[PDB]
């Protein structure tokens, strides 16, 4: 199972770590993907996680998308996690560079809420602009099921320990 976590609440932990490395090590029922509306796994998380699939999410995403049409901006769906996990989430959190609402950043963290267990990145964070404590801490305020985190960036993980 998951190992070298530290433990911030009953439920919520945290590592420096590579989610695509981390998925794959693990292969975890439920591995998190920072989509957007679209599902177009271009950058950040998505990209990466995109890319360890070989594409497979991408063309699985659009299929998706093309029978259902986009998600919303805090929504989800459940799809296939290929090579990295049973399933993958896709949580859309609101991207601040692009305007969008801060406060659905609980409403995107709310979808942890159906899955037992999940291997998931920080939402909103990165490339969508919202600052990462706040995320961690609408993360340990609203995710009541067993939430591992991953974070990238080293500087950023003790950032974030040092000032839960």
Same mark, same amino acid.
């Given at each position: ?8 609440? $009953? ?6 770590? *590579?989610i695509v490395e981390?998925a794959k090590? #693990?292969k975890?029922?439920?591995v998190?993907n920072?989509a %957007? /509306?679209?599902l +177009?796994h271009?950058?950040?998380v998505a990209g990466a996680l995109n890319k360890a699939t070989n594409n497979a999410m991408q063309v699985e995403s659009d ?14 769906? #459940?799809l296939s996690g290929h090579n990295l996990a049973k399933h993958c989430?896709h #949580? ?5 560079? +692009?305007?969008? $609402?801060?406060?659905?950043? +609980?409403? =995107?963290?709310? %979808?942890? %809420?159906? &899955?037992? /267990? ?8 990165? @490339?969508?602009?919202? $600052?990462? @404590? &706040?995320?961690?801490?609408?993360? /340990?305020?609203?995710?009541?099921? %067993? /939430?591992?985190? =991953?974070?990238? *960036? +080293?500087?950023?993980? $003790? ?6």
């Amino acid at each position: 199972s998951f190992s070298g976590y530290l433990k911030l609440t $009953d439920n919520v932990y945290i590592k420096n770590a *590579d989610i695509v490395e981390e998925a794959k090590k #693990v292969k975890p029922t439920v591995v998190v993907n920072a989509a %957007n /509306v679209y599902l +177009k796994h271009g950058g950040g998380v998505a990209g990466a996680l995109n890319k360890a699939t070989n594409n497979a999410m991408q063309v699985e995403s659009d299929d998706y998308i093309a029978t259902n049409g986009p998600l919303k901006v805090g929504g989800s769906c #459940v799809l296939s996690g290929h090579n990295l996990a049973k399933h993958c989430l896709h #949580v859309v959190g609101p991207n601040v560079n +692009k305007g969008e $609402d801060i406060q659905l950043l +609980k409403s =995107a963290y709310e %979808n942890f %809420n159906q &899955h037992e /267990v999940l291997l998931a990145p920080l939402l909103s964070a990165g @490339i969508f602009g919202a $600052d990462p @404590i &706040h995320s961690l801490r609408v993360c /340990v305020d609203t995710v009541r099921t %067993n /939430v591992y985190l =991953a974070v990238f *960036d +080293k500087n950023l993980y $003790d950032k974030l320990v040092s000032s839960f």
